[PDB]
From a paper:
Mammals and poxviruses encode homologous inhibitory proteins of [name], named IL18BPs, which regulate [name] activity and, in the case of the viral proteins, contribute to virulence. The structure of the complex shows that the [name]-IL18BP forms a homo-dimer in a back-to-back fashion, with each protomer binding to a molecule of [name], forming a hetero-tetramer complex with a stoichiometry of 2∶2.
We found that the use of an [name] mutant [[name] (8S), see Materials and Methods], containing substitutions of the four-cysteines with serines and substitutions of four surface residues opposite to the IL18BP binding interface with alanines, greatly improved crystal quality and reproducibility. The crystal structure of [name] (8S) in complex with [name]-IL18BP was determined to 2.7 Å. The two structures are essentially identical to each other with a root mean square deviation (r.m.s.d) of less than 0.4 Å, and the three mutated cysteines in [name]-IL18BP are distant from the [name] binding interface. The homo-dimer interface involves mainly βA, βB, βH and the C-terminal helix H3. The inter-chain C132-C132 SS bond covalently links the two promoters.
Author numbering:
A (entry chain C): 19 to 133
B (entry chain A): 20 to 134
C (entry chain B): 1 to 32, 41 to 155
D (entry chain D): 1 to 32, 45 to 140, 144 to 156
Amino acid sequence: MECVKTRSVNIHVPVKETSKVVLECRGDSYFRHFSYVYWIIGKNKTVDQLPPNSGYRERIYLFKKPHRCENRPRADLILTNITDEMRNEKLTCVLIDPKDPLKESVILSKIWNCV
Amino acid sequence: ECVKTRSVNIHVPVKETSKVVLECRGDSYFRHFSYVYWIIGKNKTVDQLPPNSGYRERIYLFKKPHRCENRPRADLILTNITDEMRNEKLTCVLIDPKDPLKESVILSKIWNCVY
Amino acid sequence: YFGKLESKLSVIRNLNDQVLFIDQGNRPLFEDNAPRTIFIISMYKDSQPRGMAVTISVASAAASTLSSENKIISFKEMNPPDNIKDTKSDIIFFQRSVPGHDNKMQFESSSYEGYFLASEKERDLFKLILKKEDELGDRSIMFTVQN
Amino acid sequence: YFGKLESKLSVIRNLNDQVLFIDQGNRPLFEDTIFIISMYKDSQPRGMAVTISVASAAASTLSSENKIISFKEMNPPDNIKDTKSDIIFFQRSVPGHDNKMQFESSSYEGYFLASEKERDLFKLILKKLGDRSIMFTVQNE
């Protein structure tokens, strides 16, 4: 049966801050061989691009096999030693496939305070 | 050199989809006697719910403790979401030989955060 | 509501290190391998979370479950059930750690609040019984659980 | 910024099903063989940044340098510190035809890989709606 064609990106956030904060970005693309997710900090900076020991850490899962009707890539963003800068920083995950990039972004402060 | 931590936390999706998963994770140094689970609204375990209500609980087992803590997990899974479910008080509980630890959440309040 | 989750093979001792066990008359006692010695602690989830709801059953037994019914200690012929539809039960105990002593556990009855499992000497017997707490640090209501 | 990620053994064909390949003179051509598409992450996400290299023992990497098609003797690099590169192409799907791919140059926007006949030769070239000559299929394992 023809697999159904989904393209999605989503972030799972913690409802409260801790000393280690992990953000789970998960992708969903039917482009099984050509889809992946990753984080951009603020406006245009991949984690690689950051000053060393800045508190951000990216974990991109690999060897992660695609399922039958989609690839489901994942990239966790990891915050230690949190500064208010980081608390108000715009954090964005991107889905990249042979289609126009999909983004979901978030500001932690706004969430921890949306209560 | 074990440090003694007791914690419970929920990871929520920043936006609604057709399948919504909530990740409740526990942290207790009571390696052999700690677990997490969900209570819907006021006093209802998922087991206690009308069948096909949209809630589904997945409690991870065979999930071995680490050296200095047990890190149990229970995922709450929402399909066919109704406004009721969107405003329902969802709570995860850590149970160990100490007073129970709770973190709760209302999805609408989180998704309805604009900035 | 109680929901049965996991279960653990366990050895229970009093603070004199006497091993809990069952004789041939089904009497819970303490002495100093054996099928009788091993127990199964089964954890339960709770609609009204107040601690760690557990049942205590004998491992090597068809159906032998500890009960605090009528404020006495017994073994009912039954297995710990998949769910209990009440806020309290004669076979449900809250397993709580002794303050300052995380390696020590107390077992308060759910149907009879303020009543705990205890080791009591009677002649040359050490029996398992149910008793009130009153003052604290009563070492008689403290146990070690192994695995 | 371009960050190298995952890489795929790939066979590329034009819309007449001619297989892309390299002769002994390092000419990219189409006949009736195996390449490595490497995906990169992007500081300025505009599509799927990829490199195309020959799955050889050799170092061979497709380049759109000076608006011509070449193979630079080099491996696709772990990172590129620029917003564009002569070896970086955006791999985008043909609208309405998800099984079809186009390759726009990053250094020369509006320029795509294309299959062009010559005299008796189908050669891969660079070229400035619905042009089937800039459409390809990519096959994977």
